[PDB]
Amino acid sequence: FHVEGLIAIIVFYLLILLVGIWAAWRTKNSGSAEERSEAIIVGGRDIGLLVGGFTMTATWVGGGYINGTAEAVYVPGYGLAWAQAPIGYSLSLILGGLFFAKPMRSKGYVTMLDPFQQIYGKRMGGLLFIPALMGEMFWAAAIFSALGATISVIIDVDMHISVIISALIATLYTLVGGLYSVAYTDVVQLFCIFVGLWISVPFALSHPAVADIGFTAVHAKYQKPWLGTVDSSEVYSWLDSFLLLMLGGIPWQAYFQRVLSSSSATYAQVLSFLAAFGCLVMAIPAILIGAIGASTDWNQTAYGLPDPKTTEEADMILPIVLQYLCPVYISFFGLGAVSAAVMSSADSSILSASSMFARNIYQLSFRQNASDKEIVWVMRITVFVFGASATAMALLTKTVYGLWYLSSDLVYIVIFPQLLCVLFVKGTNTYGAVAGYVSGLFLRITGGEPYLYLQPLIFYPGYYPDDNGIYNQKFPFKTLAMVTSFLTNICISYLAKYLFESGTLPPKLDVFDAV
Ligand SMILES: *[C@@H]1O[C@H](CO)[C@@H](O[C@@H]2O[C@H](CO)[C@@H](O[C@@H]3O[C@H](CO)[C@@H](O)[C@H](O)[C@@H]3O)[C@H](O)[C@H]2NC(C)=O)[C@H](O)[C@H]1NC(C)=O
Ligand SMILES: C[N+]1(C)CCO[C@@](O)(c2ccc(-c3ccc([C@@]4(O)C[N+](C)(C)CCO4)cc3)cc2)C1
Ligand SMILES: [Cl-]
Ligand code: NA
Ligand code: NA
């Protein structure tokens, strides 16, 4: 227990809160004097290029990303070949900038759910709200759990107090000011992440217990080489995971919040490209730390035998490396970097969920005659409630990671085909939307989730049991489910259009007014 690290982290938190409060004061008069609720969401559409790129990079680079890349490189049997997060993130951002985010910014939308509502109906727009909310909340809870574990590893401070304080600090400035405060804090937090991560690698590379990482990448010294390999029987699983990361990262409100706040559409394109480059730049020190951990004689350190992977502690390799192969102040620098990385994503997740709810459900479905003051108060109360709920789920649940993975798969399977259909396909109705929703939901539940101890209901070629007796799959059934959902959407939409436009079906049977 070192008091100096605690004092430093408290001072850092207070400085971040002060910056957020200052941003909220100075951006008070931006936007219309009557549309304050829409101001809190979009900022008046005046954000430049550098700020947009920095805030997008800070949003995408979180604790989970940094810890998972190092864990994937360190664990034997995975290597560098199975660290798919950086390339997937970069390709998703490049595809977004190339194809989406120009038509969305050209139409002056406020929230990602606006096209869905205006094309299908309020009921479909509200049905599409659940997966997005689940995806934001489970991701925030999982990264809060990871931050608590990291703090518990580095210092002996109780985890509950640390998690509560971090969540409270983020929620406070997100409540006081919205998008402007989030972006202005992200600008500082990205610099903190960069400096803290890059300062630690040379110190860890010079420890006497660490061997050459050029030799270890190709030859085995203490374990299997960390470059990894992909077997001929694991090509399809690799492609399935990569497609999940590359195509399921686009339909998120945490991305369209930055897209729709830009001055122009071309600026949105350029900010997406800059964010892709920033993610690629940030991915490097995590890989280096993972290689250092894989190339270390752990018997010569204070950790002692057995290895961290034998102790079932492979998810905490980065904090272990920082604590046991670096001096104390470098350890505190790394702790600050991880804290900043976690907060820069948690605040964006909470703001995105609150914006979606307050703008699209309450005002646009229940109270369509409410004043803006009511909407502002609803936004603030929603921010507080969602932050508290995320903190409670992080503290009192041990299955946060399985829920996070399942929610991400649900988002990728369901929302992405609907976005494609509304943007680029002409003639879609709500019949096809309902059909695609049902098909995507069914084809993912049928087929279990080992992390939640759920047995598969449909067995695909190549199923094998594991240690706990819960079956696994080797067939790319998630990509199949997504493609089936898209095709069902298109086919049912066009069939309904043909049946109602000219057919034996009377017009009175049009339950939804779409044709
Ligand atoms: C893991 O590291 C430890 C060091 O902390 C290694 O222990 C070392 O073992 C050797 C051989 O047993 C010791 O050399 C001789 O040990 C005898 C006692 O067995 C002692 O009377 C002699 O004077 C001589 O030191 C060596 O001292 C010992 N290291 C320390 C610091 O005492 C251990 O062998 C390593 N494990 C593996 C698998 O290599
Ligand atoms: C950037 N977004 C769009 C924000 C929220 O979702 C994502 O972060 C996301 C993150 C991680 C994944 C992910 C899924 C599974 C795994 C993993 O392979 C890791 N393990 C090897 C530990 C167990 C199995 O699951 C790693 C990362 C999927 C989506 C992607
Ligand atoms: Cl993350
Ligand atoms: Na972040
Ligand atoms: Na952010």
PDB file of C-alpha atoms and ligand atoms in Angstrom, residues 55-63 139 143 186 189-190 193 337-348, ligand 4:
ATOM      1  CA  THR A  55     -12.657  11.499 -29.357  1.00  0.00           C
ATOM      2  CA  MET A  56     -13.403   8.593 -31.716  1.00  0.00           C
ATOM      3  CA  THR A  57     -10.002   7.039 -30.975  1.00  0.00           C
ATOM      4  CA  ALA A  58     -10.549   7.488 -27.233  1.00  0.00           C
ATOM      5  CA  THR A  59     -14.028   5.955 -27.505  1.00  0.00           C
ATOM      6  CA  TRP A  60     -12.844   2.820 -29.302  1.00  0.00           C
ATOM      7  CA  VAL A  61      -9.657   2.233 -27.273  1.00  0.00           C
ATOM      8  CA  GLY A  62     -10.776   0.792 -23.943  1.00  0.00           C
ATOM      9  CA  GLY A  63      -9.528  -1.327 -21.055  1.00  0.00           C
ATOM     10  CA  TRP A 139     -19.741  -3.523 -22.310  1.00  0.00           C
ATOM     11  CA  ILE A 143     -14.817  -2.889 -18.505  1.00  0.00           C
ATOM     12  CA  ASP A 186     -11.499  12.326 -24.242  1.00  0.00           C
ATOM     13  CA  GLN A 189      -7.504  11.018 -21.705  1.00  0.00           C
ATOM     14  CA  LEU A 190      -6.141   9.838 -25.068  1.00  0.00           C
ATOM     15  CA  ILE A 193      -3.253   6.610 -22.442  1.00  0.00           C
ATOM     16  CA  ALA A 337      -3.372   4.794 -18.501  1.00  0.00           C
ATOM     17  CA  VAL A 338      -5.765   1.896 -17.852  1.00  0.00           C
ATOM     18  CA  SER A 339      -8.099   4.125 -15.812  1.00  0.00           C
ATOM     19  CA  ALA A 340      -8.227   6.740 -18.577  1.00  0.00           C
ATOM     20  CA  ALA A 341      -8.859   4.044 -21.192  1.00  0.00           C
ATOM     21  CA  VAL A 342     -11.773   2.635 -19.182  1.00  0.00           C
ATOM     22  CA  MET A 343     -13.393   6.013 -18.490  1.00  0.00           C
ATOM     23  CA  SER A 344     -13.116   7.283 -22.103  1.00  0.00           C
ATOM     24  CA  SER A 345     -15.364   4.387 -23.170  1.00  0.00           C
ATOM     25  CA  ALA A 346     -17.701   4.207 -20.167  1.00  0.00           C
ATOM     26  CA  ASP A 347     -18.748   7.857 -20.448  1.00  0.00           C
ATOM     27  CA  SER A 348     -19.467   7.477 -24.173  1.00  0.00           C
TER      28      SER A 348
HETATM   29 NA    NA B   4     -11.225   4.468 -24.241  1.00  0.00          NA
END
